[PDB]
Amino acid sequence: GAMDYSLVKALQTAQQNFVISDPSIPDNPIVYASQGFLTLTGYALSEVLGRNCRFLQGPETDPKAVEKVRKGLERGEDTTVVLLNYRKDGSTFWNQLFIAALRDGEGNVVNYLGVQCKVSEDYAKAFLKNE
């Protein structure tokens, strides 16, 4: 459950932008989305639950950034990327995206956490250069 994790409760209380996915459901869809995520992206909660978060990507999103995310998920490593994302209205923003495994007491991945932060184009260019 989403509220099993004190990090999730903290981010909820702090009114941050995040989602929780469930990799045991086909296509690793979102099972919880914060209000901040909804406001950032322009989607209603009923439009995001049950969907993989790739709906935020579009033609100007760098496929190499998406590949870094993919590899983090396949290798079990926490990961930070900066990539271009799209709101429901088609407007774009740079997203500094953090994805981490949420584990049980035996080490199994039960859920993934993704935390989104809108950053400026200038911040994004500097981040990508430094990577």
Ligand SMILES: Cc1cc2nc3c(=O)[nH]c(=O)nc-3n(C[C@H](O)[C@H](O)[C@H](O)COP(=O)(O)O)c2cc1C
């Ligand atoms: C918890 C979580 C949150 C994610 N949040 C975003 C996001 O904010 N923006 C984005 O472009 N991709 C995000 N993704 C990445 C996509 O959901 C997806 O993992 C990536 O596009 C590769 O999927 P594929 O291997 O099916 O191509 C997130 C993934 C997870 C697991």
Ligand SMILES: [Cl-]
């Ligand atoms: Cl995925």
